[PDB]
Structures are given as C-alpha cells and as structure tokens.
Amino acid sequence: MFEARLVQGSILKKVLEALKDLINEACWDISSSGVNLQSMDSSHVSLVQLTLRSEGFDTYRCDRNLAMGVNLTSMSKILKCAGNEDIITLRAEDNADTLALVFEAPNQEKVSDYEMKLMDLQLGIPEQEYSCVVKMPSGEFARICRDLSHIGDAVVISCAKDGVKFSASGELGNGNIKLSQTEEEAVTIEMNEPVQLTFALRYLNFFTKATPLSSTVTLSMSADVPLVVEYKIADMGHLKYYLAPKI
C-alpha cells in the first residue's frame, strides 16, 4: 500500500494544473523517498520533472516501489473537484491497478472520494553547472513570455553581468525586455560566463502555468544545452522544466 496525506491539497491541484497542458500521460515513481515524475512532451522538445519528497507530506506510507502510469487528463479533472483548502490523501494498493484520491473538506462534514484506473507505463538530464542562473519573480517571467509571444514565436535570452534581456521579432516588428539585478520581487543573476540562447515561446508559455506554485522562478542555462525553468514547491520539492534550444 501507498498512502500520502497532504494537508495543503492545493499543491496537488496546482501541480496538476501545471502538467495537464503539456503532457497527457506520465509515470509516477512512488518510493520510500517519495514521488518522482519525469516525462517528455509528445514531441520530445521539453522534459518536466516533479519531485515531491515524502517528508513534505503530513503522513506518508509506501511499502513497495510503484510505477503508477497516470492519465493526467483524468487526474486533473478529479483534482478540480478538490477545494483549495481540502486535505488530499492519495491511496494505492500494491497491485497498482487503481488510484484513490480522498478530499477532506477542511471544516465542513463533507468527504469526497474519487478513483482512477492506473496504466502500465527513466533517462534524465544529468546534474550540471550553468553559466547563468537567474532568480526572478515568477509573475514577471510569465508576463514577459506572454507579451513577447504576441511579437514572435522565439525568444532570445541574453544573460550578462548587468542583467538579463528577452527579445523577439516577427513580421509585426521586434521587441526586447531588459531586466536588471535588484526579495520575492528580487531579480538575481549568478553568472559564470555570458550566455545567449533561443527558445520556443509556445513551450515557455506551457511552463508558466506552474506560476501559482511559487512567486520565484529560476532560469538556468549554458550554451547549446537545455534551459531549466524551476519552481520550488516549498516544503515539498520542485517542479522543473527542461527546454531544448533552437540552433
């Protein structure tokens, strides 16, 4: 049996909201150490990697390791029946044929129980150093990507000592946005060498659906290698996105 109780149910609500629009199915590695999701989009341009550490849960039980093949469309629809203040418990027997989601209304004497069939369903990005790591408000990064996508399809990210610059160009015209170093509304560069890459705004705008999980975002980048867009899930772990460059 696997059983995790999360008092702050909204995290699962947001986490799924942030995955459904990018990937349809994914494997949930349930283990003694917790929950690990690592999936590519249907066209293999991005990789999402969710970690929810066991200690992040209010109670956490996991007797055997499980590969729970999950339909994220089904899961998201179920999580939409959860209230933002619900206590969410996940439950799976070790056979792993179905997954139970229990939502405890915080005060109200209302308890909801949903149940979902699992499917029968690991290569990763090695840890590395990054020439540039930008810590910046999630909301700002979201506005930038939304705005710049009205001008073009690609953004050129340029990181230097002074600041980080985002620029696109279409037929309409071109634009660029320059951030400068300044918390929670702080912009912070840890650069090791100046970096200029190009990425698809369509994908970035999928990534920013995770904006509710943290008021900060971390962009990490090195030449000719995938960008990393990281949202820490406080007291839990993270939700990370890797986006291959356009060369």
Binding site: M40, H44, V45, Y242, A244, K246
Partner: peptide
C-alpha cells in the same frame, strides 16, 4: 530545422 530535440541531452 533549428529546434533541437531534448533526447540527445539525456543519459
């Protein structure tokens, strides 16, 4: 042409 796949960056 220019959009690289994420595959070659996994191991």
């Amino acid at each position: 042409s220019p959009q690289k796949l994420i595959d070659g960056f996994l191991k």
